[PDB]
Predict the structure.
Amino acid sequence: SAAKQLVDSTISGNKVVIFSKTYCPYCVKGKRALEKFLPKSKITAIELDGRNDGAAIQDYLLELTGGRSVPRVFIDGQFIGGGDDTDALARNGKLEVMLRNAGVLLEHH
Ligand SMILES: N[C@@H](CCC(=O)N[C@@H](CS)C(=O)NCC(=O)O)C(=O)O
């Protein structure tokens, strides 16, 4: 399907992806967590309240990840969870490890 192809191609073609809705505070929280390490222009935020086929994309996200809710965050193709999860991973060091492994974050000393 178009929705499946969109999601698969997006997460395999972009290192940091957040499927989002503009109005959702969990999406905002996930974005702010990622922005501690990366600029906005390196975060691929797909707004499913803007896309006409947003519901179809959420349906595929249920198939791929186990849930439909936004956000759904992917690092180098790996689903890492929603907004609370992404914020927790930012705080606990694991997000940085994933971003460095993905080649989009340098060590800074
Ligand atoms: N605890 C979840 C909450 C996510 C959530 O429930 N988001 C709402 C929007 S505030 C949602 O997806 N609603 C259903 C929908 O938009 O389909 C997280 O951390 O991401």
